[PDB]
Amino acid sequence: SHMLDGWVPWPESFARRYRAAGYWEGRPLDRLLRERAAADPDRIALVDAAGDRWTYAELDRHADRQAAGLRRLGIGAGDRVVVQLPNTDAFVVLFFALLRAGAVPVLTLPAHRESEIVHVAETAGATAYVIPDVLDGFDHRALARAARKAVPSIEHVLVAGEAAEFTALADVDAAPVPLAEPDPGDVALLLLSGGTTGKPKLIPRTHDDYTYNVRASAEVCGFDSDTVYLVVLPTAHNFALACPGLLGTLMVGGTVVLAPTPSPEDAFELIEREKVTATAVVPPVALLWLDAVEWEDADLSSLRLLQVGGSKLGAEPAARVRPALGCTLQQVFGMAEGLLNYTRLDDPSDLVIQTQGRPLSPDDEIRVVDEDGRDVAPGETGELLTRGPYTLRGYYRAPEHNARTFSDDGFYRTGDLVRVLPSGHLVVEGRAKDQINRGGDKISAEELENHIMAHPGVHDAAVVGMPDATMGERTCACLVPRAGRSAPAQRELAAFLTDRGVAAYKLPDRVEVMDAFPRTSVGKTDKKELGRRIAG
Ligand X SMILES: O=C(O)c1ccccc1O
Binding residues vs ligand X (CB under 6 A):
238-239, 243, 309-310, 332, 334-336, 340
Among 105, 204, 245, 309, binds ligand AMP (CB under 6 A): 309
184/200 with CB nearer ligand AMP = 200
Residue 413: CB minimum distance to ligand AMP, A: 10
- 314 to 353: interface string for ligand AMP, x by CB under 6 A: -----------------xxxxxxx----------------
3-state secondary structure at position 369: strand
Interacting partner of 243 out of ligand AMP, ligand X, none (Cβ under 5 to 8 A depending on kind): ligand X
Closest CB to ligand AMP: residue number: 335
Distances (CA, A) of 507 to 36, 83, 311, 312, 441: 43, 23, 19, 22, 12
Residues counted in the chain:
536
Beta bridge partners, 81, equal 105, 128
Annotated binding residue at 303? Answer: yes
Q: State yes or no: residue 229 binds ligand AMP (CB under 6 A).
A: no
* CA dihedral (108, 149, 97, 396) positive or negative: negative
Annotated binding residue at 251? Answer: no
Residue 397: CB minimum distance to ligand X, A: 20
141/442 with CB nearer ligand AMP = 442
28/334 with CB nearer ligand X = 334
Whether the link from the prior residue into 389 is cis, omega within 30° of 0, is no
Interacting partner of 414 out of ligand AMP, ligand X, none (Cβ under 5 to 8 A depending on kind): ligand AMP
Q: Does residue 205 contact residue 243 with C-beta atoms inside 8 Å?
A: no
Query: How many Å apart are CA 282 and CA 311, to the nearest integer?
Result: 7
Query: In sequence order, which residues have a C-beta less than 8 Å from that of residue 523 and are 6 or more positions away?
Result: none
Count the neighbouring beta carbons within 10 Å of the beta carbon of residue 41.
Answer: 15
CA nearest neighbour of 198 among 401, 399, 473, 492: 401
Annotated binding residue at 48? Answer: no
Count the neighbouring beta carbons within 10 Å of the beta carbon of residue 524.
Answer: 10
Whether the link from the prior residue into 523 is cis, omega within 30° of 0, is yes
DSSP code at position 519: B
Strand 305-309 and strand 412-420: the pairing is: unpaired
Residue 337: CB minimum distance to ligand AMP, A: 5
3-state secondary structure at position 73: coil
127/391 with CB nearer ligand AMP = 391
Q: Does residue 263 contact residue 241 with C-beta atoms inside 8 Å?
A: no
Among 87, 123, 217, 311, binds ligand AMP (CB under 6 A): 311
Residue 217: CB minimum distance to ligand AMP, A: 14
- 155 to 194: interface string for ligand AMP, x by CB under 6 A: --------------------------------------xx
Query: In sequence order, which residues have a C-beta less than 8 Å from that of residue 20 and are 6 or more positions away?
Result: none
101/233 with CB nearer ligand AMP = 233
Annotated binding residue at 207? Answer: no
280/493 with CB nearer ligand X = 280
Opening angle at CA 174, ends 168 and 175, nearest 5:
165
30/441 with CB nearer ligand AMP = 441
Annotated binding residue at 69? Answer: no
CA nearest neighbour of 534 among 453, 466, 472, 433: 466
Among 236, 385, 428, 494, binds ligand AMP (CB under 6 A): 428
Map 267-317 to HEC letters: HHHHHHHHCCCEEEECHHHHHHHHHHCCCCCCCCCCCCEEEEECCCCCHHH
84/217 with CB nearer ligand X = 217
Annotated binding residue at 458? Answer: yes
Interacting partner of 115 out of ligand AMP, ligand X, none (Cβ under 5 to 8 A depending on kind): none
Q: Which stretch binds ligand AMP (CB under 6 A): 37-45, 291-299, 306-314, 518-526?
A: 306-314
Map 375-404 to HEC letters: ECCCCCCEEEEEECCCCCCCCCCCHHHHHH
87/356 with CB nearer ligand AMP = 356
Residue 338: CB minimum distance to ligand AMP, A: 9
Annotated binding residue at 433? Answer: yes
Q: State yes or no: residue 419 binds ligand AMP (CB under 6 A).
A: no
Indicate the annotated binding residues for AMP: 310, 332, 334, 336, 416, 433, 442
List residues near ligand AMP by CB under 6 A.
193-194, 309-312, 331-337, 356, 414, 416, 428, 437, 442
